[PDB]
Amino acid sequence: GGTHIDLLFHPPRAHLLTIKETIRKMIKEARKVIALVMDIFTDVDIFKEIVEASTRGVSVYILLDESNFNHFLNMTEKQGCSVQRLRNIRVRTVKGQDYFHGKMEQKFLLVDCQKVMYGSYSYMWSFEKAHLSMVQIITGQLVESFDEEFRTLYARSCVPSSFA
């Protein structure tokens, strides 16, 4: 059992789907579990796909950088889609050492312990329209290391202050 990696770019280069389309496809095809680590999450289309997955019964765990968490909350509020009342979604925050906010500068999407998207694409409109980015689509043995890193992060994460 080896590892397979494909690269995708924004803008696209020698592949048929954009990175956003690929994210949405990965989430749409999720059967069991989605584990997301993200620095900034404001993209409504991606959020919708994740909400939809959770309503099909997929367990969703999301870890967000604490210092940008309010941006995700604002988006969920605008959408009328409180994450606290969605029973298959858990959202927790992760921070670094303050000195200026210390941040979780890691992001990746893991689906079904089978496929990881790892790269520089953040879930914001600006990554669809403005920024250059790249990711890897990873399958096989290395996915297990992303599973373990997700668990490690999850263990260092907090309940967001807002949730009661």
Ligand X SMILES: O=C(N1CCCCC1)N1CCCCC1
- Give the binding site for ligand X (CB under 6 A): 33, 35, 61, 110, 113, 147, 150-151, 154
Identified binder of a second copy from the candidate list 85, 87, 129, 155, rule CB under 8 A = 129
User: Closer CB to ligand X, residue 35 or residue 83?
Assistant: 35
How many CB atoms neighbour CB 52 within 10 A? Answer: 14
Q: Should residue 126 be labelled a site residue for a second copy when binding is judged by CB under 8 A?
A: yes
Token pair listed for 98: 């303050």
Strands lying side by side in the sheet with 89-94: 89-94, 59-65, 33-38, 108-111, 115-119
Rounded to whole angstroms, how far apart are CA atoms 157 and 155? 6
User: Closer CB to a second copy, residue 58 or residue 150?
Assistant: 150
Rounded to whole angstroms, how far apart are CA atoms 128 and 83? 24
Please report, as residue ranges, which positions from 8 to 37 form the binding site for a second copy (by CB under 8 A).
9, 13
Rounded to whole angstroms, how far apart are CA atoms 93 and 79? 20
Q: Should residue 97 be labelled a site residue for a second copy when binding is judged by CB under 8 A?
A: yes
Residues that bind a second copy in the complex, under the rule CB under 8 A:
2-3, 5, 7, 9, 13, 94, 96-100, 102-107, 120-122, 126-127, 129-134, 142, 145, 149, 152-153
